[PDB]
Each structure stands twice: as C-alpha cells, then as structure tokens.
C-alpha cells in the first residue's frame, strides 16, 4: 500500500491506497469520510515532480500521474469551481465551511483584493463564526491576538496597532450578537462573492501583437483584463457564445457560435497553462449549463 495524506481547509485525513487506485477512488474516500455530497465544486491538488500545483485527474491511476514521489503522498482538497450564488448552491454545513475557509484565506493573503471597510466587516463575521456571541467573561483583552483578521495591506494603511485593531473588531463582533455561526459564515460568503476578483482564475496571456494581458476564467464566462487592472475586465464572452475551445501548443483558439465572427485567439506562455485553461472552461461551462437546464 501507498501512504496518502489529504488536507482540507480544516482537517487532515490519512489513507492507505493500493497501486491500482485511480484519482476518482481517492476522491470518493475523502468526500465520503468528511460527509460531503456537493462534490462537483471540489478537486484534489498536488505538487508534481516539476514542482507545479496540479489537479489530480480522476479517470487515471494516482501512481500514473506525476505525483512528487515521497511518503505519504500529499494532496490538498480544494474547491476548483465556485457556485454563482452561495445562498442557493451551498446547501451543506461542511460545503459552506470549506468554501468560507478557502475564500477567507485568499482574502487574508491578498489573492482577492478586498477594500478596507469590507475587510473589517468580513473579519467581524469570521470572528462571530469562530467565537460565537461575544462574552465579556471569556473574550477578555487579547482574545483575537492569535487570529489573522486582516490582509497585511489594510494593516499597513491604517495608523492602528494590534490592540486598537482588536478593540475596533470587538465592537463589530459584539454587533452580530445572536447570529448563529453558520449564518456568519454564509453572510461572509454573500459579501465576498461580490468582490471583483472573487472566483476568478487568472492567466497571463498575449494577443497577436504580443500585448501582455490577463485572461480570467470563472463560473460566468471568460474575461479579458488590462495587465495592471485585475478588478475591472475590459472584454467579456458569456458561455453561450462559445461553441468550441482548443489549443495547439501555446496557441489557444476559441470558436464562436455562428460563423461570421472570427476565432478569438490568444497565446499562453506554456502548454501547461492552456491545459489548465481548457479543463477550467469545460468545468465552469458544464456547471453553468447544468444550473439552468438540468
């Protein structure tokens, strides 16, 4: 047997698997173990032999994929796809929690830009979720001292120390008195899903003339961003306008639904990137359609 460790946003699982095991079998054990039924959003990521974050293909054997030969094999269980609306698509407690911890992580690390006012309101919901109702008896001075409440950028812009921050956040924690932990998690996700960079997979791409740009792939479609502005896309293609996608090495070609319009073509710096773009377009397109006409 092959030793395996699978880490979710708040849990660690140890599994021993036969060489015969395929990604799909490993995935099933994990979702089975954690009691997760809304599996279509998730995937298992691993570092490959080259050192690249890669999604484990479910139709192939684990051992046949370029997993970093070591023991145990280390995988991260993460959401690969995001719902269009959290209040209608994340039905379970484990699903909401997982999305919340992953989204919060991106906010805290500045992967997803979040303005200061919103970052503080998010921090206060995250506090209510972690601590429940503020209680003057338990939550004494310093109760938030070990928490990562805000992105570094927000801390650097305000002339406040750690204690002032924790006093301002306490006031807000106190404000959500009575709100259940699950409702604070949901409220946090409702606000976070409106952020411009929320749920967007960004890819460095070039047009014919060699201009450096960003391709964004998300639940709703494909977007093109100026190199310096990942918050406001300049061009967009809804799924219903795309009939076929494909790549030839660094060249990617997107064929429109008609015949009059030309092919939307761009170039990725690596084939690896185009493979990821294809996988992501396919997955978001399928789930997009499946929500509308099931």
């Amino acid at each position: 047997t092959i030793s395996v460790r699978v880490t979710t946003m708040d849990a660690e699982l140890e599994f021993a698997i036969q060489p015969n095991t395929t990604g799909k079998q490993l995935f099933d054990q994990v979702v089975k173990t954690i009691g997760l039924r809304e599996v279509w959003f998730f995937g298992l990521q691993y570092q490959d032999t080259k050192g690249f974050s890669t999604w484990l293909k479910l139709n192939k054997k684990v051992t046949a994929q370029d997993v970093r030969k070591e023991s145990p094999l280390l995988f991260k269980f993460r959401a690969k796809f995001y719902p269009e609306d959290v209040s209608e698509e994340l039905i379970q407690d484990i699903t909401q929690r997982l999305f919340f911890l992953q989204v919060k992580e991106g906010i805290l690390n500045d992967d997803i830009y979040c303005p200061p006012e919103t970052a503080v309101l998010l921090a206060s919901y995250a506090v209510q979720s972690k601590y429940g109702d503020f209680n003057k008896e338990v939550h004494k001075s310093g109760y938030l001292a070990g928490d990562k409440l805000l992105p570094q950028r927000v801390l650097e812009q305000h002339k406040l120390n750690k204690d002032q921050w924790e006093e301002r956040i306490q006031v807000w924690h106190e404000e959500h008195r009575g709100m259940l932990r699950e409702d604070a998690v949901l409220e946090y996700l409702k606000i976070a899903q409106d952020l411009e960079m929320y749920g967007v997979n960004y890819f460095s791409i070039k047009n014919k003339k060699g201009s450096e740009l960003w391709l964004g792939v998300d639940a709703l479609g494909l977007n093109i961003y100026e190199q310096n502005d990942r918050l406001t896309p300049k061009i967009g293609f809804p799924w219903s306008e795309i009939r076929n996608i494909s790549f030839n090495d660094k060249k990617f070609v997107i064929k429109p639904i008609d015949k009059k319009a030309p092919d939307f073509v761009f170039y990725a710096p690596r084939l690896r990137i185009n493979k990821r773009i294809l996988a992501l377009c396919m997955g978001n397109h399928e789930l997009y359609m499946r929500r509308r006409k099931p």
């Binding site: 269009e84 830009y113 303005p115 200061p116 006012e117 919103t118 503080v120 309101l121 950028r153 650097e156 812009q157 305000h158 002339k159 406040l160 002032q164 301002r168 807000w172 404000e175 409220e187 409702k190 606000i191 899903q193 409106d194 952020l195 411009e196 929320y198 047009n207 014919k208 003339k209 201009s211 740009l213 709703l220 479609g221 977007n223 093109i224 100026e226 310096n228 502005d229 990942r230 918050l231 406001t232 896309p233 300049k234 061009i235 967009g236 293609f237 809804p238 219903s240 306008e241 429109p256 008609d258 009059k260 319009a261 030309p262 092919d263 939307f264 761009f266 929500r291 509308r292 006409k293």
Partner: protein, 90 residues
C-alpha cells in the same frame, strides 16, 4: 367554501442572468449601514499616502458607480468580432 388554482411551471432561471444581479450590499440594508459606519470609523485612521494601485482602481470604480455585474453586462456588449478586435488592439 370555494377555491381555485391554475397549474403551470414558472421557469425562473435564465441564460446570462448574472448580468442583472445586484450585490448583497445593495440588497441588504444592514450590510449597507454597516459598511457606511465602517467608512466613517476608518477615515481618521487611514494614512492616505499609502494607497496601492488596486486601492486606487477600486476607489475610481466606486466613484464611477461600478459593480461586478454591471461591468460584466457592459463588457459583453457589441458583437463577437467587435470584442475580438478590441482585444487585438489592447
């Protein structure tokens, strides 16, 4: 007594519906009041000389009344050849 009821499937979903979505702060009055309060509370702690590029892009976006869904709507306008042409001209 008496009662009647017509029976028919009222399909509520829709292609490209995302374009008409609004934000939680626009549909939630409590969140909107919280954010307004937080803007005041932080105004005097802010060091205005520390502004990242994203902070500026974001403040300009707000100044101009933008939001994720309104922009998605706007940027998808035009036909496929016009948008591909703008892409090449970028």
């Amino acid at each position: 007594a008496e009662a009647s009821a017509d029976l028919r499937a009222d399909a509520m979903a829709k292609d490209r519906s995302e374009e008409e979505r609004t934000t939680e702060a626009e549909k939630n009055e409590r969140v909107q009041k919280h954010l307004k309060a937080l803007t005041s509370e932080l105004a005097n702690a802010r060091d205005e000389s520390k502004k990242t590029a994203n902070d500026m892009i974001h403040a300009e976006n707000m100044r101009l009344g933008r939001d994720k869904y309104k922009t998605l709507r706007q940027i998808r306008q035009g036909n496929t050849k016009q948008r591909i042409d703008e892409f090449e001209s970028m």
